[PDB]
Design a protein around this ligand. Sequence first.
Ligand code: FE
Ligand code: FE
Ligand code: FE
Ligand code: FE
Ligand code: FE
Ligand code: FE
Ligand code: FE
Ligand code: FE
Ligand code: FE
Ligand code: FE
Ligand code: FE
Ligand code: FE
Ligand code: FE
Ligand code: FE
Ligand code: FE
Ligand code: FE
Ligand code: FE
Ligand code: FE
Ligand code: FE
Ligand code: FE
Ligand code: FE
Ligand code: FE
Ligand code: FE
Ligand code: FE
Ligand code: FE
Ligand code: FE
Ligand code: FE
Ligand code: FE
Ligand code: FE
Ligand code: FE
Ligand code: FE
Ligand code: FE
Ligand code: FE
Ligand code: FE
Ligand code: FE
Ligand code: NA
Lengths: 154, 154, 154, 154, 154, 154, 154
Amino acid sequence: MQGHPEVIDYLNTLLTGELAARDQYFIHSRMYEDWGFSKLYERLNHEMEEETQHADALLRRILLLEGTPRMRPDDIHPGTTVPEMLEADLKLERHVRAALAKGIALCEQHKDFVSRDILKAQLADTEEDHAYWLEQQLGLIARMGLENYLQSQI
Amino acid sequence: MQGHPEVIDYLNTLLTGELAARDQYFIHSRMYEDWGFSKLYERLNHEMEEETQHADALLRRILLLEGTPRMRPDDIHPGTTVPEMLEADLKLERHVRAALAKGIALCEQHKDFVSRDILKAQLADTEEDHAYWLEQQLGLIARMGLENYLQSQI
Amino acid sequence: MQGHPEVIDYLNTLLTGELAARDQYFIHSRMYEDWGFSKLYERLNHEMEEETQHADALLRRILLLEGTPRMRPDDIHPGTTVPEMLEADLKLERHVRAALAKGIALCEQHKDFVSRDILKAQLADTEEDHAYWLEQQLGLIARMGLENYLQSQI
Amino acid sequence: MQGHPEVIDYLNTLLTGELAARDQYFIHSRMYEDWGFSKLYERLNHEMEEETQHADALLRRILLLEGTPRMRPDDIHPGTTVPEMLEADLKLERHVRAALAKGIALCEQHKDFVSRDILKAQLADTEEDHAYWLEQQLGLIARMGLENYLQSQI
Amino acid sequence: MQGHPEVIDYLNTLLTGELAARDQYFIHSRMYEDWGFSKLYERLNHEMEEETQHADALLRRILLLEGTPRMRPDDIHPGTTVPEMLEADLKLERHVRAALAKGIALCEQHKDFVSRDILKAQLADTEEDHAYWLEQQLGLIARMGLENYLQSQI
Amino acid sequence: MQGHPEVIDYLNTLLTGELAARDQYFIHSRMYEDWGFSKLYERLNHEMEEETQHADALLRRILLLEGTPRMRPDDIHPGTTVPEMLEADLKLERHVRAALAKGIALCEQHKDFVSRDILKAQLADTEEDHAYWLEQQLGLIARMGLENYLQSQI
Amino acid sequence: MQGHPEVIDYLNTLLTGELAARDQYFIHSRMYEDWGFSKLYERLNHEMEEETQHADALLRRILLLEGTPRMRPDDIHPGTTVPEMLEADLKLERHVRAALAKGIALCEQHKDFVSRDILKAQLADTEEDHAYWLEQQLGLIARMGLENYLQSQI
Ligand SMILES: [Fe+3]
Ligand SMILES: [Fe+3]
Ligand SMILES: [Fe+3]
Ligand SMILES: [Fe+3]
Ligand SMILES: [Fe+3]
Ligand SMILES: [Fe+3]
Ligand SMILES: [Fe+3]
Ligand SMILES: [Fe+3]
Ligand SMILES: [Fe+3]
Ligand SMILES: [Fe+3]
Ligand SMILES: [Fe+3]
Ligand SMILES: [Fe+3]
Ligand SMILES: [Fe+3]
Ligand SMILES: [Fe+3]
Ligand SMILES: [Fe+3]
Ligand SMILES: [Fe+3]
Ligand SMILES: [Fe+3]
Ligand SMILES: [Fe+3]
Ligand SMILES: [Fe+3]
Ligand SMILES: [Fe+3]
Ligand SMILES: [Fe+3]
Ligand SMILES: [Fe+3]
Ligand SMILES: [Fe+3]
Ligand SMILES: [Fe+3]
Ligand SMILES: [Fe+3]
Ligand SMILES: [Fe+3]
Ligand SMILES: [Fe+3]
Ligand SMILES: [Fe+3]
Ligand SMILES: [Fe+3]
Ligand SMILES: [Fe+3]
Ligand SMILES: [Fe+3]
Ligand SMILES: [Fe+3]
Ligand SMILES: [Fe+3]
Ligand SMILES: [Fe+3]
Ligand SMILES: [Fe+3]
Ligand code: NA
């Protein structure tokens, strides 16, 4: 079934963004492990798998709609310290959140309700799981201090 | 069996107080979880269930005594930080403690010994479980500092 | 992430309504049990738990959106006989249904699609589970008579 | 193997009748459930599955005999109340019974003994299971009254 | 709860379409089995069950909304060869897809968000399961030839 | 119990025909295995066992009726290639089908209803299992070509 | 421990190549599934996981050696048909093979024997698993024809 060219293009924009999110969590999780923070490694490794699934859902939907997926990831922007890395992932998730919301609006306008639902599932993941967890870590650092927070992530 | 109107009225006062305790633990537990303190969430979520059972015991006893339960909760007074929330719950439990003790005295005076025993069970919970645990947390903050205490509640 | 103030306010209106639904089922279920209708007790006790979960979902979403939840329940309006209690719960659910539908429209307008989905889940529960079951009981009373219906709920 | 054109045509008449029986039980069972009579729902849902199997046996036999099955169901005639629905299903089963008996006679005449046996299996189901159960329900309503009968089907 | 007459009417249009889809898969699956293609039989038998569930969801929703379901299936249009049957089912699913999308738009307009969600679930099934699988089979025939494809479906 | 001499004689005719069917499947199944088509071997080996049981039922019935069974099999007519062997077994089953139908008519005429039922069971096996499967194989060869069909039977 | 800058740079070149291999298998596997070749989907999905592990081993080794991993994947070059996709993956694996062999030589020269061993493990995977399997598929297409080969991958 041929999708609407505007929806396919916009799914392709989301796809290169999810491929990038996957890669930024790839490097941050391994950096965390390199420093001995295994709890941060585990969480961001898990989030890398989750972004791979988000990318996979977009890719498959684009193929079903007879589009050609764009496989070049967006640039990533890794941090160099634990607070910079948390902030960099939160900025990325906020960008994804905004992009998914605009995508849902576009899908509704072009009456592509299944693509809309696929983006809504990812939006809920972005807001209630990925971004929220990051806001919490930054909040924890603010409440107990960075040293105590890092101790808790060994 | 018709209870004494003074006992029924006083059980109704305790009931609106327990409905309020339930609700104050509802909001504090979720605030704790919002900030990433899952151990505080778990404990206050558990205490919300316990106040619901205390409310339930009062409600059922009022119905057995052919009274009409008053279902409007007392106002709650949530805190805005972990130490304010602990202090606010301790103040509420101290109020409940005093109210239950006065109720036991009233039940004894009106020779309603089963209602007295129901309040005694709740009084033991209030003093030895709910209030004591709160005093302990505040004591811990005083002994290791707030930052260390918060770290321990992640 | 800061939610839209209009959405947060409206979620807060829904929250005080769910806290009230929870409490009206609290008292009706116990009244049913007081009279010996254990099947009505079981169903409304189950519905009290369900409204507590609906309230919980709203409360958590409001906190995620950086709002302050309003914990005062709306007034309840319990019945005094089995048909009045069924009618009173149906009137409450119809009110909730209308309020949730208006909320979904508001969330769509402010492009808060995750809050919309949370309300849609609750709307489906309200229409297809809570309100429908009540309409059925009233329908049963109409078809076999109140005496037979009450016999069936022992 | 080419069947006798008269037998194939007559199997096709039975087939559109079974497709209709399936559909009339589809709607009646769901109407019963809509009203809260789950025991009537369960029985007629089960009978819908049974008519689907009766239809399936006829359809497959028609294909084996190199005919073309007629898939348009006969008109159905649902009732609007429990006694009308029982009467409407009994009238349909009595019609099926008569049609199957005439079919068995036709198959015997054209020496199609396997098609005869397939109709005999369905005739036994129609008389001893479907129609009999309906006659029993109507008999029960007559003996204990409609209100008591409906109570028993919740 | 009385639904909007325009939504009820449109659900009734979808219902007669699902009853038809169920019946077209009924006959095609049995034709496939008659020819010895058991893998096609299994898949279309499974899809017949799925359309029966789609019909059932619509029927129940119409009853909940106090409408009267229309139980006459749309005409079906079975093929006479494996490629015609695949094409005929794909044409039917494309028609259903378009009809469901228009229905979702109508439900949104009349603020019937639960009926909208029921259609969205069916739309996802239609696009991502039923229609996609058909497009794949036709694609396979194009890539390996009809003879090889038929061999693979024994 | 002495059977009718005409029925006994006719059962004896069917018996020598079943002994022959058993033997023709004996040789064809082993020829299929000799060539490496193990799926054809398995099916015709299974059908040899089934004809042995059909023969056994006739033999025992003849003895019960105090007749003397005729144990000389009819001549068989094996094919020399897979399509000739399928055609030769289909011709044999069509002959058996016709002979069983005439036998059922004869049994009905002589009011030997148990012998009739024994032949009806075998007739259903002949039409719906043995002959149908053969027609299907020949149909498959016609649809995918003989080479592909043979590949599928390895 | 600081690695040799020339080795770190060369590991970084291999890393962007493995990230690309991972992505080319990502898209090809999903394209294969889109067309209904589930065996090709399964194999290339498995190879995507394997390249992710190869990338992960390089990334971690670069961090251990105190380098900064380069996370931008090389360009990929997906095919548009099954033979083009197989050829495109074989060309990529041949490039990886050559790059790994040059890397092993470089590591030996700089006496980084553990990095050498990590590349040797990946080289064995590339030659004996990934590239060999691709050569086999192309060989199969050449021996039985593309149509038969595609049939075998459903
Ligand atoms: Fe997760
Ligand atoms: Fe997660
Ligand atoms: Fe994502
Ligand atoms: Fe998640
Ligand atoms: Fe994310
Ligand atoms: Fe406890
Ligand atoms: Fe406790
Ligand atoms: Fe208490
Ligand atoms: Fe306790
Ligand atoms: Fe307490
Ligand atoms: Fe429930
Ligand atoms: Fe419920
Ligand atoms: Fe609710
Ligand atoms: Fe529910
Ligand atoms: Fe509710
Ligand atoms: Fe049955
Ligand atoms: Fe039955
Ligand atoms: Fe029937
Ligand atoms: Fe039956
Ligand atoms: Fe029937
Ligand atoms: Fe399925
Ligand atoms: Fe399916
Ligand atoms: Fe459907
Ligand atoms: Fe499906
Ligand atoms: Fe469908
Ligand atoms: Fe068998
Ligand atoms: Fe057999
Ligand atoms: Fe036989
Ligand atoms: Fe058999
Ligand atoms: Fe036979
Ligand atoms: Fe492997
Ligand atoms: Fe491998
Ligand atoms: Fe590799
Ligand atoms: Fe490998
Ligand atoms: Fe490789
Ligand atoms: Na082949």
